[model samples]
Target chain A: GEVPIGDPKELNGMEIAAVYLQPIEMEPRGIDLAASLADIHLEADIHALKNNPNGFPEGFWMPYLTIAYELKNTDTGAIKRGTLMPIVADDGPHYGANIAMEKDKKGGFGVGNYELTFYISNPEKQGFGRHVDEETGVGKWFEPFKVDYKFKYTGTP
Target chain B: GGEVPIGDPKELNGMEIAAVYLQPIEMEPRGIDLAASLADIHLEADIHALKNNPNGFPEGFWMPYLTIAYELKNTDTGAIKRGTLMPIVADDGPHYGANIAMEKDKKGGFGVGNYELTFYISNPEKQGFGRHVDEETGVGKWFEPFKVDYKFKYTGTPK
Candidate 1:
């Protein structure tokens, strides 16, 4: 479901959006309510990150990239951290690339205005290559960076 | 209805084209006021950072200024509307860098109908980006003049 997190944020030619879904599956490890924040699944969808000109199809899933999140509950000042992995679905490749949190520790992202931050690391160090030729070389990879979004989480609709 | 890709993925000189329809908006307070009374919709195009883009990704959001002319025609009735789309960035953030903000055009603008939308993206180098470029270290020439087409299904009345 859409998390009503306002408009999409732009960073270095990328459109980043945040979404929250009901508890999802992650093979071998079923839904862990005891460790999840009210059974919520956090996700980040990005475009143009995968299956691109470097022999990848358009809209393909990006690999070798890591996404981390720092969610702060504004009401209680409680904070939580987690990592997201690349995921695929039956429909088609997720917009750009689909990366999400498998689950979270107990507690819960209670109702109130909250701040969600995402940290995207450089991909080249993780095995993604880039052209360096002077005639056709592209730009350099952006250093590790974080983006923030403010919204009210009224529990899942 | 919603922002969706136009036709087949269009590519030229390592560039790709994608477009979508945004519900018409009034930029004043950033909300739709006369939506029920409106028959026009906002149009946007996503040209930069497309999949398979050869320039790779850049650190900054760079858009080559260019002129975009639009021709919208009702396929069923042959009624036509023509205008130029301006480049605008919502104070909130930029979405695709191309826009058609005609909130003050008129009431009952296009009416409920099925139509064809054509866009002409003129060469930006010829138009200029208001910068100083030299032969030693400058970006490549802008893409050549090209036209893109898409189909729009407008539901004039608010749901």
Candidate 2:
């Protein structure tokens, strides 16, 4: 549940920084399927705050926290959205898009209501795709979202 | 790095915009004047349905700050250059389209472009502003394709 990076910029001593992605509460390490999968561990708790040139430190300094997640099967809507990976910043506040769903033998999410939404950029987030692959020019991925929140997933674990 | 569109659909009181443009980052230096190459230019904006403290946003709950234009043309002799470099950061604002510290436009990697580089996003005094203008209190509405063509292809200046 750690994946929040916003932009409401403030510096020149006008100091302002903010981030907080806390909304994922479902931690289970149990097993019970084969041709089907569900071994997810997505939890959250990241925080940040800076005001009027304050003490500094409220992270993701260059922005790039894009998210558009979905795992549905509410009877059978078939959904599995874009999922990129990268997180290794440490100075303490909060950061995580934590995802560990393994069962490479195959997968099929069927039990709707698993959504997340977020997109931000700046010298750091410009790789949403769409490449017609004219031989291999990968073209087919679009996102122009900046601030819209609602996170929490896999509600029937 | 171009994907900008912000509210101004005829100043209809109801707001709507979308943006995303990334590809520039070089952290840890926090400068004001000293070896200034300052990176971090992250931006965001997807505000919808407006209605709050409208004084143009400051102490309100929804902040709005726009205006990111970096232009350099030469697509090959079309010779054009506008808005010199200025990423010098310290504090910009509560925005969805800015990450501060931006002065890295190697458009002219020191030789080549001859011209053709575009980036736009308007509505901060430049009048009709960018991305589907109307905010001049001019009232209009149309949402189906936000704009930010994202172009880069030139090299002639950037030691």
Candidate 3:
């Protein structure tokens, strides 16, 4: 019982699949952003597939994305970053957001051991994959991916 | 009649997905130049509406050697970084079938921001990413872990 059934998704060929940190029970401590368009409570889930014979069969996409992140605090080493755009008026084909890093800068969660990095970039000038969403028509997918994700708030009582 | 039985992890939602894109369309520049940056970072996996119908992942059990585990996060300060653990193969094996050469730029230490990539496939007898069983063929050596959620940038300009 080896597990087979994958392979096929290449729109300009180049893929990245994995980036997460949504498992915080209690450790936010900051950046509520009035309720959230996305900040500290954190979340960034993106997946864009390739390989389209005609697309849509699980080809992978929720495209139309833009991201950025960088936080370093492995114990006072101190470092903060940001970027998680695309609320383009809450465009369709939704994907998570808000952990853009610049959590309004300047502060201290004082937690312990922290290191995260992600820079998801994708636009389109050529023919890659997942097309359609000329503005909420839905069905978005492009190619210009990156990878990396993690989180360990480990605080708050 | 491949198999179909997944038993040990079912969080909720999702039938197919594996992505990250943008091969071109200008407008980029935060930090990209993985030797030549044209930003062609990519990955793909869509179950074709439940593997064409009937849903798959055990029923149609055919995981030849699927392993995708990458982690990182700090688009600003959410901190979840531990990067590196990748092994993706799409070919001949026992749990047979599915996968490729996925890489979105960066070493195993992880860079940029926003990632927790995971996709592990095994059938060492339905193992959970810790398959142990080769005592001459006792079976029960299958690995498992299907985790996906990505984002990590470096601008369009790297090969």
Candidate 4:
């Protein structure tokens, strides 16, 4: 007699639309410029970065966010999944980009805790200039505000 | 046959719609004190004849269009009906406060030769005080516009 495959039972469906509350936190990372440019006068026009013909490349201001997820089967007390979410550079209000993760990727059919970490530059500098001008009393600036994150998904029944 | 009173068809119909072409005519009539005062300032004002004191009247302008309707029979050739459509004082555009006579009283029925005349304060003193104003220079003043005179008939059907 040949081996036969058994029929799989139909799985029940369940959906959950619950708020995933996460405590919000933010901190200002001070501005940074090329070491060689530090000797320039505050009133003098100076660029924030320089291309060195010999030393390591200078870095510019870049904001990023780190998120983590964990899932467990409440009835079985077993860990089913874990994952991390990333927020890359070049994402800002004008671009209107956001971060998200799906249930199957984070973990399978369980309940657990998720967390997110956000980082932004203080007096965030961009282009070829300092974020603030102390001489003519004019420059770009921003105040810290709360950032909201929302997550939604379903688990196996 | 006994005589039946047959009213004049022309009079019977009255002057329902009279079309009397008007030629421009000028008249120098003395006006009332109020009208004179208004006119001295070039304001478009009317001075009605006082029942008792007509001499102390103010002198101003007038353009009259008189209509005479003569009665006529089927064979009769001369006019037998006569009536005058007098232009009275009213707020009308351009002619602001100039007298106008319309054949119909209803909206949009003022009809054929009916006109919109414009009149300005002819008197130097009243020039910048009425409806005229200068927005850029802020030198002149503004005045209100009015229309007048609307008369018609409600008699017989067209022959």
Candidate 5:
């Protein structure tokens, strides 16, 4: 069973890239113990068909929005929650970001089916300004929204 | 003084590498109680576009899927330690890049002295991105593994 780097999903006029779960060594005191965890890198790639409210170019990462994620277990009902930080890599910028997800007491997510939810909000609140001019304004920001995806963790990788 | 930008960054063939070292702090969601308990300082490196890089990578954006490793040597004592840096992001929206908490407890933290650091950047293809070397839809080929060196002085506290 291999952990998946999922497929992209389209929601709210954006293409949310798949969830990439991989083991990361925090390099705790040079020992693998006590600080090893998995990173959940979620990328909200742009939806080629839609234009951004801020008028930023397409095919690039978005800014000024808050993205919070929740992962709930289907069996135990346990859940992990935290806001995702926006970031850029050599691959280019995207709307999504990465966070450390605790797998176990020692740091592994194990095998399970998870319901992943993302809450996207506050573009204007995050200071994403728009051109509200009567002649040049693009469009109003989308309402605060949330999307859910089913994540299967096979516990192999 | 602000964080010192180490080394001159230029597009070598197709990639550019730049870095900085600073006091370590706890990242969100996973605070000091966890992910950062054993760290001393943070080592960060940016692998991104050079305005005129042949790949046409956008300026000021970062590239993903590359491996960055570091080696820190004490200029006086000759002690050495090496570790791989991890990619990290912050809620602030822009500090997205690769970094690592220097494992002070294990590798022994830097003393109040001068030190030399070397970073090794590996090709991204190993991380699964396809290399389209053909004429039509190809992005470009990966740069060969390369290394960069930097020098800095650690004063118990960074300016």
Candidate 6:
């Protein structure tokens, strides 16, 4: 089910952010045997509260989202752990890569089908800033936001 | 050179003890081509002083020497980075495998011969622990201690 989209302003005010990834599904365009053999890679970028009034705190700011990879065997539906790519500040258009089966069964590999998700926090916080109560001294809390993308291998079986 | 022998201490009087590790020569073992192709990974360890007493602070109190492990890669030489494994307590063993690499060039399975391991610092005052003299006040300094180990595959040749 689709989650209810919150007010863009209210999301910007969150304090913490986290990310979660789901298993990937791959389907070949033509043929039967080759269909289940196709490999896929997943990648994505995260953005923080687009509708918030403020941007983000100085120096302490990290990219509003994180990148991750996972693998899935289309035939058996077996899932594999993924890797977290290092962050690159303002590179070209392609921000990351999700190589197929790049990691072995222990969660490392180069080739395989996978799904990725990025979770950003607080869309309503001012400038990506969370509110803190000075008197009670309690910090504001925010839930994670997420986005997903997929890449499939088109090579011959 | 001949190995030097030493005697054990008999009393607990004030004494200075020093430990040392010889510099290691990183070499690519034969047959392991892929492992040799990988970059060299450097390992290091250091000891830092946490607290000191001029006259002795309390009874049964012993000053502890702490060691920390660090790693450096061929692409980023001298840029010491923290290892993934955390340290364990009780064992005073000089942390091993702070850094690592495997032989991938020889088409052989991961081999240990193509790579070499070494240790360093293990502890230092500035990087370790000791009070620093700031502008007006004396600040206390400290560091967490632990044992280290490593494993990796090589992807480069000796330069």
Top lDDT hit = 5
The model with the greater TM-score, 2 or 4, is 2
lDDT order of candidates, top first: 5, 1, 3, 2, 6, 4
Q: Over all chains combined, what TM-score does candidate 1 have?
A: 0.41
TM-scores, chain A, per candidate: 0.73, 0.20, 0.25, 0.22, 0.71, 0.37
Task: Point out where model 1 deviates above 4 Å.
Answer: A28-38, A49-62, A91-108, B1-159
- lDDT digits (tens) for residues A1-157 of candidate 2: 3332233433232212323322222111111112123344222222224442312124323222343434444443445544422221212111233233334234444233333333332212332111121221221122343333333333324
- The stretch of ten residues in a row with the least summed lDDT in candidate 4 chain A is A87-96
* Residue A151 displacement (Å), model 4: 8.4
Error of 6 at B11 (Å): 62
C-alpha lDDT of candidate 4 relative to the true structure: 0.19
lDDT of 1 by residue, B92-120 (tens): 22323222323334533455568788878
iRMSD, model 2, in Å:
19.0
Two-chain DockQ for model 2: 0.03
| Model 2 Cα shift for residue A33 (angstroms) | 18
Question: Interface root-mean-square deviation for each candidate?
Answer: 21.9, 19.0, 16.6, 39.6, 12.7, 26.3
Give the per-residue lDDT digits (tens) of candidate 5, residues B48-98.
666654443566545655677888887876778777765443322122222
Candidates 2 and 6, the one with greater DockQ: 2
Residue-wise C-alpha lDDT for candidate 4, range B70-128, written one tens digit per residue: 21111122112212122222111001121122222233333332222211212112211
Q: What fraction of the reference structure's interface contacts does model 2 contain?
A: 0.00
Give the TM-score of each candidate.
Answer: 0.41, 0.25, 0.22, 0.15, 0.49, 0.25
Candidate 2 residue runs with Cα over 4 Å from true position? A1-47, A50-157, B1-89, B92-159
Give DockQ per model, in order. Answer: 0.01, 0.03, 0.01, 0.00, 0.04, 0.01
Please say which candidate is ahead in DockQ: 1 or 2. Answer: 2
> Model 1: which residue pairs collide?
A35-A105, A35-A106, A51-A56, A53-B52
